[PDB]
Design a protein around this ligand. Structure first.
Ligand SMILES: *[C@@H]1O[C@H](CO)[C@@H](O)[C@H](O)[C@H]1O
Ligand SMILES: *[C@@H]1O[C@@H](C)[C@@H](O)[C@@H](O)[C@@H]1O
Ligand SMILES: [Ca+2]
Ligand SMILES: [Ca+2]
Ligand SMILES: [Ca+2]
Ligand SMILES: [Ca+2]
Ligand SMILES: [Ca+2]
Ligand SMILES: [Ca+2]
Ligand SMILES: [Ca+2]
Ligand SMILES: [Ca+2]
Ligand SMILES: [Ca+2]
Ligand SMILES: [Ca+2]
Ligand SMILES: [Ca+2]
Ligand SMILES: [Ca+2]
Ligand SMILES: [Mg+2]
Ligand SMILES: [Mg+2]
Ligand SMILES: [Mg+2]
Ligand SMILES: [Mg+2]
Lengths: 131, 254, 201, 142, 220, 68, 221
């Protein structure tokens, strides 16, 4: 919004970035500290990318560039908190007796050799007749 | 019939039960008077054919009221292209020894035209399957006439939506899949030859007979039926054919 | 004879057409459409067009989710045992139909405040011998987003409303401009419509 | 219109674009923001895709962004209302007309035969049982 | 936020004639775009979920009988029931169906009018086991009074008492279509044994004089 | 531990698989030898595409596998 | 047709949190607004907020901000509502609903209703104190009786007379609350032929406490 008889004039938000259309420079020229300018600038073009509720589990959103950055919290992996896994195989060592394979935060149990596991995972049982 | 319900007495009149030594063997479907349809693999290793009895109109196994008309079976006819011990061309037409008098609890279900079955009675997807089959994959045969509503699938959907188990028979053009993939509703073991009848505008038509299926309503699987449209004309020709002195004869097909 | 592919629903205001790419050489097409647990309704029989209308079926129940498939009959004839086909993406009209480009109906400066009415375009969804207006199908889910500015140097000052009317104060110094944009915030895709034709006083 | 080298006076959007047919350059000079100029251009210089009256058989065309929508009459369908709905009464019309059996007769509208044990009625499309027990009809439900 | 004012809080009517109801609204519900008034009516027989009655203030939901009828435009809306039957006895709720947040009305109880009858009030001294446990809850009953409005005046040794008392009213009965208030005043041993005479007064529209029922501690 | 049971010293290879039910959906009470229970007991046969442990009666049930 | 099967009834201690569910069947789950309505007795209806499944958009009533949270899982076609830090004001009957067809067309289909109770009371059977008239020199053809039920929790309790035979002519008053307890009575009027006469008892059954008391009305109160 570099209209005639401007710039040398004192800075103003509304008179530049709302009445008419200010640029990024005219942005900082009013707000100085770059972070706070972004606080407005990420709204000016990219209207609001998280005015819906995409990231579940009460995902707070900062809404910077149009990439839709959202803060996720503990107990839920992923940026949108959508991955509902219990953080590990450590819960009852995989609902089991010995341990659980941590194959990318999945639930795949196993027991020791000669102590064959059930299909879904339970107490280890001897395999043969004299294990 | 896992996940099925009880067919109220008479609401499944075309259903026909077959007994060998009085023991449950298969289902069936009465067409007009003396001709019944049951899957071809029902009668494979049965000796003493004279002990083949077809009770029709039955509703409750553990009871004998006045609605169970029982007639013998003189001759069974199967396609010659059928191979013993296999699944292709699983359909048989039976020449009942004596005609049966129809009643309220005995109404016969008959075939549609080949073009009609190919064009209209294949795009309804909501058709009943009835029988006295087991209620579990290991087995608990229901003494009551169970019925079940099933969905319909074309052969490509069945292949690309179910599981990819390699140890299963292929799906020929003579057979088409049916059943729920989740594993809640599927005929189990006593429903071979059981009618798979599709309702269409106040009239039921025989559009399939239960033939096989990997297990009973397993994860990602369907029960393969027998598309009767391939055999409508052959049944129509054999039905109006002269009686023959055989017992188990394999009529030419096509 | 080859199967179809790149099936897509080009729908706006519930005017749904199903289109597929491969050209019909020695080959004709037919398409069926059905709901999750409905009956397969066949349409566009043996047609050589690479597209087929389906508005008259989704208009029956817009809220349901629809599934469609397209066979390929060899030219001249049926098939051997089964036609070769290809399904289509599941299309729920209510959540997916594109919103038509809105039009501004009127605008008047009462006092120092303007009043930008928005014309309500009708949709293909029918009722008892009449088409249903856009408001009549969506209701509360339909909000608007007006942009006004000075003629020179633009300066879109966005605004929102839940009605076909607007009441916004101005500086009484220059003839503002208007551009409305029908927005459904309850969707996930196709939320915002294309901007209205610009209108200034 | 009034040229007089117009580029001195700051041109109002109305005067330059929504009055005379402005080019992209004029609009870019006015808005002074490339992004918004592109959006306004695609919405404004889109044009009326309805100058060829694409809809037949009495259909109200409606312009959109590089698109048109035909508001077809009840007796028609198609993207341009091209298809006669009432002229697709052949046997593949989900068993078109006939309740029991349709046959694609050559050169004539389909004929409704129907199964043994039934017989046609005056309507000529559906038929009713003629015996005590027809095919696949449950008399318990009557 | 829109406030909705069901003008009759609780109206009574003999089964058979025509009733009319009102439900005002602060902000007008008429959308000028398509000239529809976005208010919904509901019928809720007690103990049952509220079945929908009429949407858009004029359109019957599929299955609603053909006697319910909505009318009105703008801020005042009306629901009419013709030839009232026994099933119409319910509480009806209008709803703002235009702007979030959705706000319901205060409801409108429906009552079956019947020939009014004076209540049968009978006071009751405490039970024998009631004293031994350590309770002193004297209760005096009322039965078969119409209409609903009633008042009770508890007196202890001739002085009116309004502490620790409790009341309960039944819904309209099926046979007599009447309510039965129950006023109980609860004490413990010492206060009950510090004052002697107990009396409860039934002030009802049926008569200008409250019917008196009383007992004395000294005789019991 | 280490139970000393006869390994059945298989004389025929076909009677040595497990009880293959068969994908088909018919009921015929055939018989199979269970390698655990020392008996050629009864199992329900679907009627098609099974293994070679289907037996019409108990006589050949015994004959084919169990060393007579 | 369609139905909305909500969860069972709950009785939470203060400070706990309930989780009401509402399963949708018969229609397209992801294309209809699932409502929630609170109905405290003596307060009519009070809209809480709705969620559109699949999209996830929610619209909470302001007076329920934080208190009520709506989640939805479309794979099982059931909605969920969670009320946190329960108080005595949350003791009400909640519903779920499905929006109508042609836009803002009300709530076409309602759930059966769910009763939620929050109180610091304990599972206590009552001490039913019988009733009997005093002097009552009138003693007309009609005589009133009763058995006061106080000190029990939770509701409800069945009350009758003479093992249900004396069921015509009773007025079971609604269970009112006082001193963090429930109290109700049961007035029956009988002819003099049965009172003052042979045993006339009131039968009280508290299902929660598995209680069966048959205290009999006796003269000389
Ligand atoms: C009319 O105009 C549209 C767009 O230019 C075109 O698609 C039609 O083919 C024509 O009839
Ligand atoms: C536009 O809409 C269509 C349906 C027809 O009614 C036309 O006459 C009208 O101009
Ligand atoms: Ca400027
Ligand atoms: Ca500037
Ligand atoms: Ca500047
Ligand atoms: Ca300026
Ligand atoms: Ca500058
Ligand atoms: Ca500067
Ligand atoms: Ca029997
Ligand atoms: Ca000019
Ligand atoms: Ca220029
Ligand atoms: Ca110019
Ligand atoms: Ca210029
Ligand atoms: Ca255009
Ligand atoms: Mg300003
Ligand atoms: Mg102008
Ligand atoms: Mg210029
Ligand atoms: Mg220039």
């Amino acid at each position: 919004a570099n209209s005639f008889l401007e710039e040398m004039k004192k800075g103003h938000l509304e008179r530049e970035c709302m009445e008419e259309t200010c640029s990024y420079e005219e942005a900082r020229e009013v707000f100085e500290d770059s972070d706070k300018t972004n606080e407005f600038w990420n709204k000016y073009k990219d209207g609001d990318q998280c005015e819906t509720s995409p990231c579940q589990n009460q995902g707070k959103c900062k809404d910077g560039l149009g990439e839709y950055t959202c803060t996720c919290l503990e107990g839920f992996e992923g940026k949108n908190c959508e991955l509902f896994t219990r953080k590990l195989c450590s819960l009852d060592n995989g609902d089991c007796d010995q341990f659980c394979h941590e194959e990318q935060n999945s639930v795949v149990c196993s027991c020791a050799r000669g102590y064959t596991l059930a299909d879904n995972g339970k107490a280890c049982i001897p395999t043969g007749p004299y294990p | 019939i896992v996940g099925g319900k009880v067919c109220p007495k008479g609401e499944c009149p075309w259903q026909v039960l077959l007994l060998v030594n009085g023991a449950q063997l298969c289902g069936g479907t009465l067409i007009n008077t003396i001709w019944v349809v049951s899957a071809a693999h029902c009668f494979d290793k049965i000796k003493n054919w004279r002990n083949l009895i077809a009770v029709l109109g039955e509703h409750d196994l553990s009871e004998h009221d006045g609605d169970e008309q029982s007639r013998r079976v003189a001759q069974v006819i199967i396609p010659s292209t059928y191979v013993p011990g296999t699944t292709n061309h699983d359909i048989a037409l039976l020449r009942l020894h004596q005609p049966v008098v129809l009643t309220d609890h005995v109404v016969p279900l008959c075939l549609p035209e080949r073009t009609f079955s190919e064009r209209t009675l294949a795009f309804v997807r909501f058709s009943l399957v009835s029988g006295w089959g087991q209620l579990l994959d290991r087995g608990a045969t229901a003494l009551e006439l169970m019925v079940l509503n099933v969905p319909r699938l074309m052969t490509q959907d069945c292949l690309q939506q179910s599981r990819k188990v390699g140890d299963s028979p292929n799906i020929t053009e003579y057979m088409f899949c049916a059943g729920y993939s989740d594993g809640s509703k599927d005929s189990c073991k006593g429903d071979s030859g059981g009618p798979h009848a599709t309702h269409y505008r106040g009239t039921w038509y025989l559009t399939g007979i239960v033939s096989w299926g990997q297990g009973c309503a397993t994860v990602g699987h369907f029960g393969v039926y027998t598309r009767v449209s391939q055999y409508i004309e052959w049944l129509q020709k054999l039905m109006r054919s002269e009686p023959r002195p055989g017992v188990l004869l394999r009529a030419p097909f096509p | 004879t080859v199967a179809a592919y790149n099936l897509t629903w080009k729908s706006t205001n519930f005017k749904t057409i199903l289109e597929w790419e491969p050209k019909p050489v020695n080959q004709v097409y037919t398409v069926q459409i059905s709901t999750k647990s409905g009956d397969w309704k066949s349409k566009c029989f043996y047609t050589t067009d690479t597209e087929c209308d389906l508005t008259d079926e989704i208009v029956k129940d817009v809220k349901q989710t629809y599934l469609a498939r397209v066979f390929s009959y060899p030219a001249g004839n049926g098939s051997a045992g089964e036609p070769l086909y290809e399904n289509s993406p599941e299309f729920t009209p209510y959540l997916e139909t594109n919103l038509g480009q809105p039009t501004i109906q009127s605008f008047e400066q009462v006092g120092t405040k303007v009043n930008v009415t928005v014309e309500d375009e009708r949709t293909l969804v029918r009722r008892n011998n009449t088409f249903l207006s856009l408001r009549d199908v969506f209701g509360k889910d339909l909000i608007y987003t007006l942009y006004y500015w000075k003629s020179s140097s633009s300066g879109k000052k966005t605004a929102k409303t839940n009605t076909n009317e607007f009441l916004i104060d101005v500086d009484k110094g220059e003839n503002y401009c208007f551009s409305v944009q029908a927005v459904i915030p309850s969707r996930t895709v196709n939320r915002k419509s294309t901007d209205s034709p610009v209108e200034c006083m | 219109a009034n040229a007089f080298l117009e580029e001195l006076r700051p041109g109002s959007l109305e005067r330059e674009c929504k009055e005379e047919q402005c080019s992209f350059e004029e609009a870019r000079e006015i808005f002074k923001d490339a992004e918004r100029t592109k959006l306004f251009w695609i919405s404004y210089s889109d044009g009326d895709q309805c100058a060829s009256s694409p809809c037949q058989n009495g259909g109200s065309c409606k312009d959109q962004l590089q698109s048109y929508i035909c508001f077809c009459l009840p007796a028609f369908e198609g993207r341009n209302c091209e298809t006669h709905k009432d002229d697709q009464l052949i046997c593949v019309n989900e068993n078109g007309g006939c309740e029991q059996y349709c046959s694609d007769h050559t050169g004539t509208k389909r004929s409704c035969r129907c199964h043994e044990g039934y017989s046609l009625l005056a309507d000529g499309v559906s038929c009713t049982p003629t015996v005590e027990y027809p095919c696949g009809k449950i008399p318990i439900l009557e | 936020d829109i406030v909705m004012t069901q003008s009759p809080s609780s109206l009574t009517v003999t089964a058979g004639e025509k009733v009319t109801m009102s439900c005002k609204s602060s902000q007008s519900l008429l959308s000028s775009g398509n000239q529809k008034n976005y208010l919904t009516w509901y019928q809720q027989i007690p103990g049952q979920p509220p079945k929908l009655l009429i949407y858009w203030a004029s359109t019957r939901e599929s299955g609603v009988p053909d006697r319910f009828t909505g009318s009105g435009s703008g801020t005042d809306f009306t629901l009419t029931i013709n030839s009232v039957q026994a099933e119409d006895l319910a509480v009806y709720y209008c709803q703002n169906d235009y702007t979030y947040p959705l706000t319901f009305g205060a409801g409108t109880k429906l009552e079956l009018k019947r020939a009014d009858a004076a209540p049968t009030v009978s006071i009751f001294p405490p039970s024998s086991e009631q004293l031994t446990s350590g309770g002193a809850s004297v209760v005096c009953f009322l039965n078969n009074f119409y209409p609903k409005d009633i008042n009770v005046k508890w007196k202890i040794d001739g002085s009116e008492r309004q502490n620790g008392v409790l009341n309960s009213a039944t819904d309209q009965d099926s046979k007599d279509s009447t309510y039965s208030m129950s006023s109980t005043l609860t004490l413990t041993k010492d206060e009950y044994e510090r004052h002697n005479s107990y009396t409860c007064e039934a002030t009802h529209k049926t008569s200008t004089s409250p019917i008196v029922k009383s007992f004395n501690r000294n005789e019991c | 531990t280490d139970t000393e049971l006869p390994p059945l010293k298989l004389m025929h290879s076909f009677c040595a698989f497990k009880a293959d039910d068969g994908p088909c959906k018919a009921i015929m009470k055939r018989f199979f030898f269970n390698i655990f229970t020392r008996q050629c007991e009864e199992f329900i046969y679907g009627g098609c595409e099974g293994n070679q442990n289907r037996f019409e009666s108990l006589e050949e049930c015994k004959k084919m596998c169990t060393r007579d | 047709q369609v139905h909305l099967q909500q969860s069972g009834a709950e009785l939470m201690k203060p400070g706990a949190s309930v989780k009401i569910s509402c399963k949708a069947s018969g229609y397209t789950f992801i294309t209809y607004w699932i409502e929630w309505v609170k109905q405290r007795p003596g307060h009519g209806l009070e809209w809480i907020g709705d969620i559109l499944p699949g999209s996830g958009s929610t619209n909470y009533n302001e007076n329920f901000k934080g208190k009520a949270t709506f989640t939805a899982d479309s794979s099982s076609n059931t909605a969920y509502m969670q009320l946190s830090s329960l108080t005595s004001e949350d003791s009400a009957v909640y519903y779920c609903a499905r929006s109508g067809y042609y836009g803002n067309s009300g709530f076409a289909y309602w759930g059966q209703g769910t009763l939620v109770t929050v109180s610091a009371a304990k599972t206590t059977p009552p001490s039913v104190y019988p009733l009997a008239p005093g002097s009552a020199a009138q003693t007309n053809s009609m005589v009133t009786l009763g058995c006061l039920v106080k000190g029990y929790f939770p509701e409800p309790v069945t009350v009758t007379w003479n093992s249900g035979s004396l069921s015509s002519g009773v007025h079971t008053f609604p269970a009112v609350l006082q001193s963090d307890l429930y109290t109700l009575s049961s007035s029956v009027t009988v002819p003099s032929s049965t009172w003052p006469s042979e045993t006339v008892t009131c039968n009280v059954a508290h299902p929660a406490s598995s209680t069966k008391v048959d205290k009999k009305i006796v003269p000389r109160d």
